[PDB]
Design a protein around this ligand. Structure first.
Ligand SMILES: *Cc1c(COP(=O)(O)O)cnc(C)c1O
Ligand SMILES: *Cc1c(COP(=O)(O)O)cnc(C)c1O
Ligand SMILES: CNCc1ccc(Cn2cccn2)cc1
Ligand SMILES: CNCc1ccc(Cn2cccn2)cc1
Lengths: 430, 430
């Protein structure tokens, strides 16, 4: 298919994320190649090279077409594409589970693989609810979280999305009614933790778990909070016997400057979800980890087996590329790499602070954010970014980047310059 | 990795398997070290043996493992573009697959929403149905109706339409969305069943968004078959009472029941349809939810807004590319004759099971062969019995069944059915 043919088929038949099909002002851009940190897109009938500043929704940490990851896939493809995990096991699953248990916060020694982040959150919730059924306390059936959060798009995951500002707000009437603490602040305030504890204490007998994104809340607004809050949550949850679940689907694998964001606080949750960067952006995969005690208790009493089992559970292809991606991360000085990236983002975004439509500029590891005073118009932002050789995808009032770890300092500067210019056009601005 | 004994050790310590109580399962996973064509290489007593994948790896590997055309499609795509985000970008594999799917599915399904798993595609179908009625200004239409014996995945909304009387999610009924269940659909056609279904639906019509069923064959809920005429009745009932019709074809799609889609046996089209499993030929996780023009347009009518769903790996180029090849390979051969031959082989090979003391029924529909027993099938007995006969079988409940790859030769089907009969014989010796 030519790019024009692709556009025609796409307009007629393809539903895109978070959209009203046939009603979007900004049409999809055709992508025809991806190599390293760069995408080849078609614009005005011609190929242009642009930086993947979004890492393809925060997944492509080593860039595209990395030879180690490519070859891990093709090596597994030759041996065994896939077998059912119901009754069988295999080397890629074992290798990946071993790696994940070793690098995640202490105590997480059991791994349930699934095919997507939203499913891994549903699995985490199922684990927490079934845990309490195994304990003979089935009244512990609600979840608690703080506002500003996002945990995926399946119906239980939607129930812990921010109720007012979250994308799933219109569904509140049909979702499980969960417990919400106020928005966690950026700076540490002991009063916030005290109030969280008081609220949790009131509901403890009906709460299976607290579920939060640690340190960085991504899709709900790119908000950062002090890691000390996580220390407090761990303490509160321990004292009131509520399980602690960390959703690290966005924060995992070095993105915030630590291997997992939990590590900024030295905290271990009872259950943890990972995904996105897990596969280096090649294939869909996610995992839910839990402690041995959680795993055992889930089938205690009359609770029985954990009744979940995705058809493509522990897919050899996805596991094999994930193993390579994780090993590639661990085999380099990733901490210094992310520190350099953060410094580049900070330096490059500094001039945005003085722009009239900019409310805040903030950086956490390989995450750089310009918060604006109005929603960002994609019809204006997209051409401006492409004109500068950068693929950016703003949402709400945020112009942000989560670039591949392989970006050179010059590439980071190109990205930040494009971001600054997009921000200038938000408030330029007719 | 890397030896089978090392794999077993890691697996035992760290890996949760589907539908199981980790650390409490009597039958350990068998190590798989390769798969090619219709065969798996499994480790039995430290030795690698080749056995037939009679299950098609949970009903996905319709062309066998490592089919050169599907391998090639994957590697070709890998060399150009592994993945880009579908939020703002489009690409050739997504367009090619969407065009194929709209062309080969029941008439009227012209819009495709890709996702990463079958369970998610069911949640998307439900979200579409609910949002459709919100767009029509009828937010009271928010429940689902189905018949008993059904299965639709493991995420929490999908669980709500699993049969709560003995279905795998039966313990959760108290916390799931309360749906409307008609009695078990009979095998033989009885107009009285449809008349009763209609009377029940009529009472709930004002609160029903959709009827959701598996057409012709109910898989995970019990390998039950029903007359396709029932689907004709459902279409008519749904039309007359203004309730959407959703067919979950995740198990029945792509030729499995002898028609390209099971709906084709009845000559009807649903308003929304889910596909998955065999979609990728069993290489990678992918699923899709299709809907009519009316559903797509309405969903964002009446101020209902965008469809707020968007999997991170939505429309993954690798998964789409191998699916295009799988679908084209199916369409480019006389698949209908192939399935007819498979059905004849299964029927001929399973006939001797009817006389066995523990066998209550033997039934075949397309490339699906089922021996139903009068007691649960002990995996500890069935597994080595089948393996010693060169066949991988995975019974569940009281069912010894096969859904073999379409590439199975008559000799291979004879081998599969012989193993099934021996398993059934062993069941009845208690
Ligand atoms: C396999 C299947 C699903 C989806 O289950 P997953 O484990 O998510 O693949 C849904 N519906 C039916 C009828 C199925 O057979
Ligand atoms: C991306 C993400 C998810 C899962 O979303 P998917 O679209 O299913 O990948 C869940 N939680 C968080 C915090 C995420 O960033
Ligand atoms: C793989 N998830 C869907 C699915 C669920 C149950 C079944 C039947 N089964 C149950 C246990 C083993 N197989 C088949 C597919
Ligand atoms: C891809 N599903 C998770 C997810 C949801 C929202 C966002 C933020 N976003 C919303 C629109 C474009 N980006 C990022 C990841």
């Amino acid at each position: 298919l030519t790019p024009e043919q692709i556009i025609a088929v796409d307009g007629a038949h393809l539903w895109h994320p978070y959209s009203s099909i046939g009603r979007e002002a900004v049409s999809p851009v055709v992508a025809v190649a991806a190599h390293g940190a760069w995408l080849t897109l078609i614009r005005d009938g011609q190929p242009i090279e642009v930086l993947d500043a979004m890492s393809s929704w925060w997944t492509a940490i080593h860039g595209h077409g990395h030879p180690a990851l490519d070859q891990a896939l093709t090596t597994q493809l030759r041996v065994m594409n896939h077998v059912m995990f119901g009754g069988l096991t295999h080397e890629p699953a074992a290798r990946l589970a071993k790696l994940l248990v070793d690098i995640t916060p202490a105590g997480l020694d059991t791994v349930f693989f699934s095919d997507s982040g939203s499913v891994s959150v549903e699995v985490a919730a199922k684990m927490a609810l079934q845990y309490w059924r195994g304990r003979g306390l089935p009244g512990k059936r609600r979840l608690m979280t703080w506002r500003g959060g996002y945990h995926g798009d399946t119906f239980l995951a939607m129930s812990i999305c921010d109720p007012h500002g979250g994308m799933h707000s219109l569904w509140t009437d049909v979702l499980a009614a969960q417990v919400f603490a106020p928005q966690v602040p950026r700076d540490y305030d002991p009063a916030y933790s005290a109030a969280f504890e008081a609220q949790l204490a009131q509901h403890a007998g009906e709460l299976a778990a607290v579920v939060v994104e640690p340190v960085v809340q991504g899709a709900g607004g790119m908000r950062f909070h002090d890691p000390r809050y996580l220390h407090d949550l761990r303490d509160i949850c321990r004292r009131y016997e509520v399980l602690l679940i960390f959703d690290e689907i966005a924060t995992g694998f070095g993105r915030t400057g630590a291997l997992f964001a939990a590590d900024h606080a030295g905290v271990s949750p009872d259950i943890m979800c990972v995904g996105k960067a897990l596969t280096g952006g090649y294939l869909s995969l996610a995992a839910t980890l839990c402690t041995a005690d959680v795993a055992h208790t889930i089938s205690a009493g009359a609770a029985g087996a954990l009744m979940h089992g995705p058809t493509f559970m522990a897919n050899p292809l996805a596991c094999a590329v994930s193993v390579a991606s994780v090993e590639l991360l661990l085999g380099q000085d990733w901490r210094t790499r992310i520190t350099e990236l953060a410094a580049g983002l900070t330096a490059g975004l500094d001039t945005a602070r003085a722009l009239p439509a900019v409310t805040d500029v903030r950086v956490c590891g390989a995450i750089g954010v310009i918060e604006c005073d109005r929603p960002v118009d994609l019809a204006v932002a997209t051409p401006a970014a492409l004109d500068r050789g950068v693929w950016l995808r703003p949402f709400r009032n945020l112009v942000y980047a989560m670039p591949p770890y392989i970006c050179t300092p010059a590439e980071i500067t190109q990205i930040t310059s494009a971001m600054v210019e997009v921000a200038r056009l938000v408030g330029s601005l007719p």
